[PDB]
Every structure is written in structure tokens, then in C-alpha cells.
Amino acid sequence: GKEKSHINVVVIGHVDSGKSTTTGHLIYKCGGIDKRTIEKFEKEAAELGKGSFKYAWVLDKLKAERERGITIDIALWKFETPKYQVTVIDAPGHRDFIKNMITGTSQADCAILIIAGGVGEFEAGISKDGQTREHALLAFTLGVRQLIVAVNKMDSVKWDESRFQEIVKETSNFIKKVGYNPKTVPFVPISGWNGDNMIEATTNAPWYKGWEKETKAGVVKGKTLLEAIDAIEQPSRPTDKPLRLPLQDVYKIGGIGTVPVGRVETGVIKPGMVVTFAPAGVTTEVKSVEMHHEQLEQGVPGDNVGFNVKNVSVKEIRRGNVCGDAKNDPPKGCASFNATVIVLNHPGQISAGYSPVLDCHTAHIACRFDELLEKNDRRSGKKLEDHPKFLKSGDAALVKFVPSKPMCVEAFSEYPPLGRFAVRDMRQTVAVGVIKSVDK
Amino acid sequence: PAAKSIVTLDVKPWDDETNLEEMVANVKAIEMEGLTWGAHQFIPIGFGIKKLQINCVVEDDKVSLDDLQQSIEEDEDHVQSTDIAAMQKL
Numbered sequence: 075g076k077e078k079s080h081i082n083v084v085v086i087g088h089v090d091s092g093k094s095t096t097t098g099h100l101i102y103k104c105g106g107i108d109k110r111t112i113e114k115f116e117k118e119a120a121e122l123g124k125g126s127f128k129y130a131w132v133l134d135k136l137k138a139e140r141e142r143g144i145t146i147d148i149a150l151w152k153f154e155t156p157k158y159q160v161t162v163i164d165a166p167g168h169r170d171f172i173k174n175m176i177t178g179t180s181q182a183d184c185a186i187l188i189i190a191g192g193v194g195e196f197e198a199g200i201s202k203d204g205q206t207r208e209h210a211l212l213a214f215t216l217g218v219r220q221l222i223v224a225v226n227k228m229d230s231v232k233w234d235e236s237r238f239q240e241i242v243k244e245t246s247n248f249i250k251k252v253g254y255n256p257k258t259v260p261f262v263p264i265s266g267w268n269g270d271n272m273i274e275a276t277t278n279a280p281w282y283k284g285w286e287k288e289t290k291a292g293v294v295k296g297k298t299l300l301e302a303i304d305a306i307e308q309p310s311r312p313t314d315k316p317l318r319l320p321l322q323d324v325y326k327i328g329g330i331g332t333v334p335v336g337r338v339e340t341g342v343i344k345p346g347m348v349v350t351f352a353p354a355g356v357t358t359e360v361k362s363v364e365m366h367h368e369q370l371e372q373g374v375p376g377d378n379v380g381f382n383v384k385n386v387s388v389k390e391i392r393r394g395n396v397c398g399d400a401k402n403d404p405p406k407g408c409a410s411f412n413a414t415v416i417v418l419n420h421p422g423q424i425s426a427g428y429s430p431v432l433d434c435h436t437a438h439i440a441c442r443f444d445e446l447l448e449k450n451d452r453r454s455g456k457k458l459e460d461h462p463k464f465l466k467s468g469d470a471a472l473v474k475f476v477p478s479k480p481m482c483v484e485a486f487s488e489y490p491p492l493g494r495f496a497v498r499d500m501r502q503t504v505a506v507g508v509i510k511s512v513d514k
Numbered sequence: 515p516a517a518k519s520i521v522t523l524d525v526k527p528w529d530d531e532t533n534l535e536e537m538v539a540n541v542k543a544i545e546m547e548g549l550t551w552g553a554h555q556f557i558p559i560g561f562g563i564k565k566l567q568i569n570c571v572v573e574d575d576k577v578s579l580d581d582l583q584q585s586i587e588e589d590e591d592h593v594q595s596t597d598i599a600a601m602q603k604l
């Protein structure tokens with residue numbers, strides 16, 4: 075039982091791709107979620123014959139049990155690989171997931187695109203207006219640079235090599251148009267239902283020599299999807315960057331006083347540091363830090379911590395403010411910020427003056443699109459025009475935003491979790507933004 | 515069948531004295547076509563405060579999570595905020 079590094083993965087794909095069975099199989103065989111339910115159905119499966127059972131049948135029963143509302147575990151799902159503890163999201167088709175993908179915690183280190191191999195199903199999945207392409211575009215935009223492709227339902231096309239090759243070619247075109255370099259992406263032919271190439275290699279495709287990917291140090295090869303996930307590259311965590319801790323809530327506890335709560339996004343928080351809260355600019359000492367039941371010596375990136383501070387009323391700090399270190403690039407409010415905005419498909423056009431609500435870290439503030447500064451080629455960033463008069467679906471543009479209330483944001487290159495945002499309107503996320511400059 | 519998602523909501527109280535059983539009773543009394551409440555637990559977050567962590571399963575086309583969060587937050591006597599702890603496709 076070796077010590078593991080933690081990574082986050084998001085699984086995307088069309089409704090007929092089988093991505094839920096595929097993700098569910100990995101969690102079943104390499105994790106421990108809802109295992110009492112799994113055990114009940116493994117035993118029940120004796121009724122189908124004399125004892126044998128398929129994991130896909132148990133997954134089907136687990137799904138129905140979840141639909142009834144009687145399973146116990148929460149929706150935070152994990153599984154292990156030789157190197158990693160993986161936190162995985164089988165992306166919901168829910169339209170409110172878009173904002174959660176942009177501003178939620180746990181942004182992905184790698185996306186896994188599941189493709190149906192069948193002829194009709196494959197084509198339906200690569201539509202330009204489909205939810206799958208929007209998910210891949212959002213991941214690319216947010217800096218998810220690693221991608222694995224799994225071509226599922228290979229049994230339905232009889233494990234035909236030509237079919238796999240034509241899907242690889244067509245999917246390489248699909249992902250290149252989003253922005254990914256196909257040479258860096260493993261293509262794995264799998265059967266999520268029968269287990270081929272999931273955890274163990276298939277015996278149904280003698281032509282299959284394995285997947286490969288180019289990396290900065292060389293070419294990495296494997297056979298299975300579990301090997302492709304273990305091969306994800308270890309991303310550098312922001313432990314040594316300056317503290318940033320957006321507040322989610324602020325409590326007044328009898329005998330303790332003020333207790334802000336939030337996730338450490340960058341840096342580390344420790345008792346005895348002197349922190350500052352922005353947009354207000356209040357400064358104070360951290361008295362103690364707690365998480366779950368333990369008192370901590372330090373809260374590191376990813377920890378959702380409570381901390382007690384003196385001489386700060388709950389009225390002067392609130393959700394959406396950002397705590398950082400007074401002696402290491404303290405956070406500050408801004409007068410405006412300029413960001414690259416990618417407009418998603420939606421029933422409208424954007425002109426200067428538009429003032430929807432933006433969700434950025436834990437802040438929810440309407441911000442004016444004060445000026446449309448440039449229109450750009452999305453993938454390369456090249457300026458196409460100065461001062462476009464309007465933006466339509468698909469456009470990438472540099473926009474100057476002015477917040478309607480005091481707001482603390484950051485450039486995405488410096489502090490990623492405080493530099494990406496969702497723009498809400500018409501009951502949906504209509505655009506995603508990446509902050510490029512801030513006037514503090 | 516209709517597309518669904520399983521969501522875990524975090525519902526935060528005002529302090530360490532908020533009546534948590536009332537808080538979860540109020541959430542579970544919310545009825546929306548396509549919404550199924552599931553399991554819940556009260557989880558310490560530090561300093562004696564516990565949040566409610568509750569599962570629900572939603573039909574994507576029928577239940578707005580933005581609206582559900584807003585509805586839960588109308589119980590101002592018990593609830594300070596709500597957040598999505600995690601969500602998955604079913």
C-alpha cells in the first residue's frame with residue numbers, strides 16, 4: 075500500500091458513449107464507493123444463474139439504487155492507480171454543472187473523452203453544438219492540457235482495426251479544432267461493459283499494440299485505460315505561492331469569536347501568520363486553524379478550513395472576500411480587470427454595457443463589459459480586430475470589466491482559482507473568462 | 515428515461531447553536547417534480563460548527579439547482595449559505 079499523489083480527472087462524452095458505466099467500472103474495481111450496495115447486488119446476482127455476475131450488471135443495480143435516494147455515500151468519487159489517488163467527475167449533463175466546472179473546487183488535471191465507436195453514435199457525439207464539445211472547450215479554456223480518449227463500444231463494431239483508426243482520425247480532428255494536440259493524447263479502444271482494456275488488456279484485438287503519447291521527456295506507451303490514467307503527468311501544486319483563501323462563510327462562535335471558513339487555493343495558512351482580507355483591507359492574526367475534527371498546524375492548498383481571528387466582526391468580512399498574507403503579496407480589491415472571454419452558445423449577442431452577474435471563486439457580482447478591446451483567434455490568441463462592436467457565440471475577446479461592488483480577483487497566470495469566472499444569463503452560463511490583467 | 519444527476523449539497527448554519535434537525539427537516543420538505551432527496555449527515559467543519567451534507571437526485575431538465583439552492587436559502591432562520599459539495603452524472 076504505497077503513498078499516493080492526488081489528481082483530479084473529469085470524464086466527458088455524449089449520452090450514448092457509455093461514459094457512466096466506464097467511470098463506474100473504474101470506481102468499482104479501483105475505489106471504494108457505496109461498497110455495501112455493491113455487496114448486496116453481488117450476492118443478489120446469484121439469482122441470474124449459479125453465482126457468476128458481470129460488474130456492469132451490478133453497476134446497473136447500483137444506479138437504480140442511487141435513483142431511489144437510499145445509497146449512503148456522497149457524490150465525491152475517488153479511485154486509485156499505482157501512483158495516484160484520483161478524484162473523478164463523471165460530468166453531469168445538467169446545465170448548472172457548467173458554472174460548477176468553472177468555479178467549483180477541484181479543477182481537472184486531465185479530461186477523459188469517451189467516444190462511442192458505433193457509426194450513428196460516433197457522429198452524434200462530435201456535433202459542433204453538442205454538450206461534449208462544449209465540455210472539451212471549457213476544459214481547454216481552463217488550462218486542462220492533458221487529455222485521454224477512450225473509444226468505447228468496440229464490441230459493437232467487432233473490434234475492427236479500420237473502424238478504430240477512422241475514429242482516431244476523426245476524433246483527432248475534433249480535438250484539434252478545440253485546441254488539443256492529438257500527438258500528446260492516448261487513444262484507447264475499450265469495452266466499458268465487458269472490461270476490455272480497462273484494468274486488464276483485451277484479447278479481442280490482436281492488431282492492438284497499445285496506446286502512445288508524446289511527452290516532454292519521451293514517448294509513453296501502455297495498453298489499458300488504467301495505465302493511461304496512471305501516466306497522467308504530476309502537476310505542480312501552489313504550496314509555495316502567496317496565500318489566497320476565498321471566504322465561503324463567516325461565523326460568530328460564542329467564546330471563540332470570528333471564524334471565517336473557506337478553501338485554501340494557493341499558499342499555506344498557519345496559526346501566527348498575519349492575514350489581510352480583501353476588498354475591505356482588514357488585517358489581523360490567525361489564532362488557530364481547524365478542519366473537520368482536527369486542529370491544524372497548517373492548512374494547505376485544497377483544505378477547507380475554519381480559522382479564528384480577533385478584532386474582526388462578522389459584519390466587516392463576508393462571503394466572496396479573499397484572505398491572504400499581509401507579508402507576501404496581500405490581496406487587494408480592483409477598480410477593473412481585463413479578461414479573455416469565450417462566448418458560449420446562447421440566444422443573444424453581447425455589446426459594451428452588458429452587465430450580467432459573474433461568479434469568480436466565491437464572489438457573485440454583476441460586472442459591466444465596459445469595453446470590448448479586441449477580438450482574437452481563440453487557439454493562438456492572435457488579435458483579429460481592435461474594438462469589435464459586438465460578440466457572438468464562439469468568439470474569443472479581450473474585455474475590460476468594471477465590478478459593480480468591491481471585488482478581489484487575480485490574473486489567471488498568477489492565481490488560477492481567482493482568475494477564472496463564469497458569466498450567467500438566460501438561466502445558463504453564457505461565457506467563460508480568464509483574467510489577464512487587474513487594476514489593483 | 516430522463517437524464518439525471520446526483521448532487522451533494524452542503525447547507526451551512528448560522529452558528530454552533532443552530533437547530534440542525536429543523537434545518538434538514540426544512541430542506542427535505544422542499545418538493546419539486548424530478549427531485550428525490552437522499553441520505554444526509556451532519557459533518558463538523560471546525561470550532562463546534564457542523565454543516566448539513568445531503569444528497570439529492572435530479573432530473574436535469576426539470577430541476578434547476580440554482581433555484582433549489584435559492585429555495586433552501588429562504589430558511590434564513592437556520593441557513594447561512596448552500597454550496598455544491600460534489601455532483602455526478604447518473
